[PDB]
């Protein structure tokens, strides 16, 4: 696009991964204001409007909130406390023809300072004196629509930097385009914490025997305790059983009678009691009361 017609395009109901922007190995002035770039893909924001121009690269340091200049005064202005990312990279190899790229025609003069996030489109010329222009260009006409000269013999400061603005505004609307969410594989039949699509909890994920209609997203039983969460990749229905807990009780015949005791781990399977308590962290005197010949359920 052009700088007189950089449209405020609404690209909605999509995703946009930025790790391919991270390992592109061509970025120059990747600047994210407001939020860090390391927490940009996992969490998103609403109003995901975007802009595009190939701006000349010698005053990208002027592109800042609370900083004026030439581009900030006449081409593109940022508001204070910007939430969003401005991205600049080298554009020497592909937008460079012989004799200069005379297609990115740009405005040099405007009567007032630009408001932030305003697309300025015009045809009429700059007014600076008192004598009006009669259509024929004269001594104070001052034609603002000047030319970028982008030759291949320019240096990296004079060669242009391609700008895209992923601005994040705050309006009463949900987000449309966000970054991706990485996901690992699933484990089965284990007391494991999980991160599903919205809900997290502790329990044992087992195979199920019931069925779902295609609109239930999770499940629950009587006294508001959940029983099933949808896994949205494999399309096989899993359940939850809470992994086991309980009290312990110690059976003794008296300290005057003998020194031996019997320990009661209640309502558990009697195979995972070295996995239940930390038998590797406790004493070897405790480690002989987790397994042995006299294991009874």
């Amino acid at each position: 696009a052009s700088v007189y017609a950089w449209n405020r395009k609404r690209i909605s109901n999509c995703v946009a991964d930025y790790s391919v922007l991270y390992n592109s190995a061509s970025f120059s002035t990747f600047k994210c204001y407001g939020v860090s770039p390391t927490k940009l893909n996992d969490l998103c924001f609403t109003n995901v409007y975007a802009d595009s121009f190939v701006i000349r690269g010698d005053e990208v340091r002027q592109i800042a909130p609370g900083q004026t200049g030439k581009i900030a005064d006449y081409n593109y202005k940022l508001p204070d406390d910007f939430t969003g990312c401005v991205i600049a990279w080298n554009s020497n190899n592909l937008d460079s023809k012989v004799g200069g790229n005379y297609n990115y025609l740009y405005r040099l003069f405007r009567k007032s300072n630009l408001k932030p996030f305003e697309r300025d489109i015009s045809t009429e010329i700059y007014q600076a004196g008192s004598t009006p222009c009669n259509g024929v260009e004269g001594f104070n006409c001052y034609f603002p629509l000047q030319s970028y000269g982008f030759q291949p013999t320019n240096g990296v400061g004079y060669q242009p930097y391609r700008v895209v603005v992923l601005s994040f505004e705050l309006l009463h609307a949900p987000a449309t385009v966000c970054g991706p969410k990485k996901s690992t594989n699933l484990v089965k039949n284990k007391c494991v914490n999980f991160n599903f699509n919205g809900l997290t909890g502790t329990g044992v994920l087992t195979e199920s025997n019931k069925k779902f209609l295609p609109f239930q997203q999770f499940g629950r039983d009587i006294a508001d305790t959940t029983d099933a969460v949808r896994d949205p990749q494999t399309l096989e229905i899993l359940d939850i059983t809470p992994c086991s807990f309980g009290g312990v009780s110690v059976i003794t015949p008296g300290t005057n009678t003998s020194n031996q005791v019997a320990v009661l781990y209640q309502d558990v399977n009697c195979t995972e009691v070295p996995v239940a308590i930390h038998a590797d962290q406790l004493t070897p005197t405790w480690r002989v009361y987790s397994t042995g010949s006299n294991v009874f359920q």
Partner: peptide, 8 residues
């Protein structure tokens, strides 16, 4: 809501 409830 989106909550499945069975026989309750």
């Amino acid at each position: 809501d989106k909550v499945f409830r069975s026989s309750v």
